[PDB]
């Protein structure tokens, strides 16, 4: 069988399961950077305010176009934005031109940043006609949208700092201008290895994409240039929302009397293609987006590449703490891919068919939740660590003050179980428990592992038929830790989690 459990057709999906969205309006906990009174289907949003307003402080993005973005001139102060304009407005005919341009306003990194991948992409991968299109058309249009920034991003953008429950809704056009700036590496205070202020934020400037000779760089660049060509040729018209969510109160899991919810589990398909209208899980790093702007190319980075609007979260999203997540609604898919990791390839341009909601956001909700990175297998069965993963997933899944009927299914899979070393069977149970507490169903993609599909299905049906509650199951996990893990002095326990559970339940 290719899938097991509840038929997928019986699962909830947006926009049809959603409550009617309230009127989009700015408030204390929601920054909105466009004219809501003028928001209209098929029209490019109008920025609010009309003219550029600048904040250069501890609580906001430091814009490249700030009048406070200054550089010491050899002993005076000069405008970095003027320097950027001067640098980027020359014609490029060879890759060195682009490097020299970028380095003019990054003089301190002129020996630290490597541009080999950029040069090799342009000179040694691209055909002549492709190179020419790059430097005659794509790059100069990217410069122009980048330098429009003060006309496009007129409103200060608040940092989504630790412990803030806050949303930012901006236009895709606004995101394009900002991401063109990141490509040209124009964001100040985001470069130094010994940086203090932004040391708790991810990289945003794209310099590490131009590094080294990994054969995956041409594929990353092609995916991004597909995006940049699309958004500079024709301005996108939708909005995107970025929400930091920090929960205070977490369940007493051992006491949770909620029953398990429904499961569909399948070894075919992916979260992004087959999770339409469902809460899509991003298997995140705490620094959101992971290595997308450097050498990362697994689940999170592939999603950030094919939906590049995700990357901008890096500009304003502080490292996630154990009780936090980031929820992004409205990103658009611009590319298709084949492969994964060192076999990843840009396939072709994608024409996103998603409907938009009443706020003109693509009906695509993605949550970044970072699992723990386990160095040793048994580490993950320690109860503090099991509880941490439950609470993380719960925060990702829970939507405060929304009823169950209006909650889509969760589209997830092997969270924390590739690069992060987790056990899939344990995490699957953890996600099922968290989903149950949040009152959502689970659509679980095993990414080609048919045996894991059967195993997750069988356990889930076994616990459901026996009517075990979230608490009953969590207690079983604690039992497995005490009996099989706590003073197991060897690398692997004597018996595995699922057989333990079956035996513990049937003999009771
Ligand atoms: N598109 C897609 N759909 C479903 N399942 C997938 C997909 N891509 C990968 N997978 C499965 O999910 C598994 C976990 O993916 P991975 O990217 O390794 O997630 P981790 O949580 O272990 O790693 C997180 C870290 N890597 C990048 C992040 O920024 C973190 O640094 C992986 O081994 C596959 O079995």
Report domain extents, the chain. Answer: 1-508
Atom of ligand 1 nearest to the CA of 420: 22
3-state secondary structure of 189: coil
Which residues are CB-contacts of 224 (< 8 A; sequence separation ≥ 6)? 183, 209, 305, 308
* Residue 312 CB neighbour total at 10 angstroms: 26
Tokens 């000179």 sit at which residue?
Answer: 123
Q: Is the CB of 290 under 6 A from ligand 1?
A: yes
Pocket test for ligand 1, best of 418, 426, 427 (most atoms within 8 A of CB): 418
Helices 497-506 and 470-480 sit at what angle, rounded to 10 degrees?
120
Is 315:178 a contact under the CB 8 Å cutoff? yes
**Could you say which of 120, 219, 301, 365 is catalytic?**
301
Q: Is the CB of 344 under 6 A from ligand 1?
A: no
Does the annotation place 85 within a ligand binding site?
no
- Give the residue whose CA is nearest to atom 12 of ligand 1: 414
CA of 416 to the centre of ligand 1 (A): 7
Task: Of 364, 371, 426, give the one whose Cα is nearest residue 393.
Answer: 371
Q: Which two tokens stand for residue 174?
A: 């606004």
Pairing verdict, β 279-284 and 410-413 = parallel
Does the annotation place 219 within a ligand binding site?
no
Q: Which two tokens stand for residue 339?
A: 């492969």
In whole angstroms, how far apart are CA 86 and each of 81, 105, 145, 351, 481? Answer: 9, 10, 15, 35, 62
Q: Is the CB of 413 under 6 A from ligand 1?
A: yes
Residue 134 per-residue DSSP state = I
Atom of ligand 1 nearest to the CA of 283: 21
Q: Is the CB of 366 under 6 A from ligand 1?
A: no
Q: Is the CB of 305 under 6 A from ligand 1?
A: no
Q: Where are the alpha helices (DSSP H) in 277-318?
A: 299-306, 313-316
> Which H or E element spans position 410?
strand 410-413
Which residues are CB-contacts of 460 (< 8 A; sequence separation ≥ 6)? 5, 260, 263, 265, 432
Pocket test for ligand 1, best of 293, 298, 427 (most atoms within 8 A of CB): 298
- Give the residue whose CA is nearest to atom 21 of ligand 1: 416
Question: Counting runs of H as helices and runs of E as strands, what totals does the chain give?
Answer: 16, 14
Atom of ligand 1 nearest to the CA of 303: 1
Which residues are CB-contacts of 232 (< 8 A; sequence separation ≥ 6)? 138, 141, 142, 144, 145, 176, 180
- Give the residue whose CA is nearest to atom 31 of ligand 1: 285
CA distance linking residue 357 with residue 241, whole number of Å: 12
Resolution of the experimental model in angstroms, please? 2.1
Is residue 455 part of the annotated active site? The answer reads no
CA distance linking residue 470 with residue 472, whole number of Å: 6
Does the annotation place 417 within a ligand binding site?
yes
Does the annotation place 363 within a ligand binding site?
no
Q: Which H, E and C letters describe 40-97, residue by residue?
A: CCCCCCCECCCCCCCCCCCCECCCCCCCCCEEEECCEEEEHHHHHHHHHCCCCCCHHH
CA of 59 to the centre of ligand 1 (A): 32
Does the annotation place 409 within a ligand binding site?
no
Task: Of 122, 143, 142, give the one whose Cα is nearest residue 131.
Answer: 122
Is residue 472 part of the annotated active site? The answer reads no
CA distance linking residue 407 with residue 402, whole number of Å: 7
Dihedral (C-alpha) 289, 266, 383, 488: value to the nearest 10 degrees?
Answer: -110
Q: Is the CB of 275 under 6 A from ligand 1?
A: no
Helices 217-233 and 172-183 sit at what angle, rounded to 10 degrees?
140
Task: Of 229, 223, 233, 230, give the one whose Cα is nearest residue 348.
Answer: 223
3-state secondary structure of 310: helix
Q: Is the CB of 445 under 6 A from ligand 1?
A: yes
Is residue 370 part of the annotated active site? The answer reads no
Q: Which two tokens stand for residue 219?
A: 């594929």
CA distance linking residue 443 with residue 412, whole number of Å: 6
Q: Is the CB of 420 under 6 A from ligand 1?
A: yes
Q: How many residues does the chain have?
A: 508
* Residue 375 CB neighbour total at 10 angstroms: 8
Breaks (C-N over 2.5 A) in the chain follow: 74
CA distance linking residue 446 with residue 267, whole number of Å: 5
**Could you say which of 173, 203, 219, 282 is catalytic?**
282
DSSP result, 342-353: GG-EEEEE----
- Give the residue whose CA is nearest to atom 32 of ligand 1: 418
**Could you say which of 173, 300, 309, 332 is catalytic?**
300
* Residue 122 CB neighbour total at 10 angstroms: 22
Q: Is the CB of 416 under 6 A from ligand 1?
A: yes
CA distance linking residue 504 with residue 482, whole number of Å: 13
Does the annotation place 340 within a ligand binding site?
yes
Largest Cα–Cα separation, the chain: 81
Is 166:313 a contact under the CB 8 Å cutoff? no
Residue 481 per-residue DSSP state = I
Atom of ligand 1 nearest to the CA of 298: 17
CA distance linking residue 293 with residue 201, whole number of Å: 13
Which method was it determined by?
Answer: X-ray
In whole angstroms, how far apart are CA 302 and each of 60, 288, 294, 494? Answer: 28, 13, 12, 37
């Amino acid at each position: 069988k290719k899938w097991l459990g509840t038929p997928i057709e019986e699962m909830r999906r947006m926009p049809r399961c959603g409550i009617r969205l309230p009127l989009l309006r700015p408030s204390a906990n929601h920054t909105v950077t466009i004219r809501v009174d003028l928001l209209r289907a098929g029209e490019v949003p109008k920025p609010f305010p009309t003219h550029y307003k600048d904040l250069w402080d501890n609580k906001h993005v430091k814009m490249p176009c700030s009048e406070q973005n200054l550089y010491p001139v050899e002993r005076t102060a000069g405008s970095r934005w003027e320097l950027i304009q001067t640098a980027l407005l020359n014609k490029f005919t060879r890759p060195q031109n682009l490097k020299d341009a970028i380095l003019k306003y990054n003089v301190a990194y002129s020996k630290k940043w490597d541009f080999t991948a950029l040069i090799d992409f342009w000179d040694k991968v691209l055909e002549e006609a492709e190179a020419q299109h790059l430097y005659q058309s794509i790059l100069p249009d990217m410069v122009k949208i980048a330098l429009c920034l003060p006309n496009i991003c007129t409103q200060p953008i608040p940092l989504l700092a630790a412990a803030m429950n806050h949303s930012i809704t901006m236009s895709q056009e606004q995101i394009a201008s900002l991401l063109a700036n990141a490509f040209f590496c124009t964001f100040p205070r985001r470069n130094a290895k010994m940086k203090s202020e932004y040391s708790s934020y991810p990289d945003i400037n794209f310099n590490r994409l131009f590094e080294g000779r990994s054969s995956r760089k041409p594929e990353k660049l092609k995916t991004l240039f597909c995006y940049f060509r699309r958004v500079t040729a024709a301005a996108p018209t939708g909005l995107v929302t970025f929400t930091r969510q920090s929960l205070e109160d977490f369940p007493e899991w051992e006491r949770c009397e909620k029953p398990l919810t429904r499961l569909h589990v399948t070894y075919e398909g992916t979260i992004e293609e087959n999770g339409q209208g469902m809460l899509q899980v991003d298997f995140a790093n705490r620094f959101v987006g992971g290595g997308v702007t450097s050498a990362g190319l697994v689940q999170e980075e592939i999603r950030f590449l094919i939906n590049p609007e995700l990357i901008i979260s890096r500009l304003f999203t502080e490292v996630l703490d154990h009780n936090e997540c980031l929820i992004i609604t409205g990103t658009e898919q611009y590319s298709e891919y084949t492969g994964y990791a060192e076999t990843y390839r840009w396939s072709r341009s994608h024409e996103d068919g998603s409907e938009r909601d009443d706020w003109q956001r693509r009906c695509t909700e993605i949550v970044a939740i970072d699992a723990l990175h386990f160095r040793r297998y048994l580490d993950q069965f320690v109860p503090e660590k099991m509880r941490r993963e439950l609470n993380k997933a719960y925060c990702g899944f829970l939507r405060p003050g929304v009823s169950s009927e209006n909650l889509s299914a969760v589209a997830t899979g092997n969270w924390g179980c590739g690069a992060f070393g987790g056990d899939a069977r344990l995490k699957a149970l953890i996600q099922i428990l968290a989903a149950a507490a949040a009152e959502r169903d689970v659509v679980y993609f095993t990414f080609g592992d048919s045996e894991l599909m059967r195993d997750i299905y069988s356990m889930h049906i076994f616990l459901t038929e026996r009517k075990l509650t979230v608490g009953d199951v969590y207690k079983l996990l604690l039992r497995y830790y005490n009996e099989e893990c706590r003073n197991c002095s060897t690398p692997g326990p004597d018996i595995k989690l699922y057989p333990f559970i079956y035996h513990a339940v049937e003999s009771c």
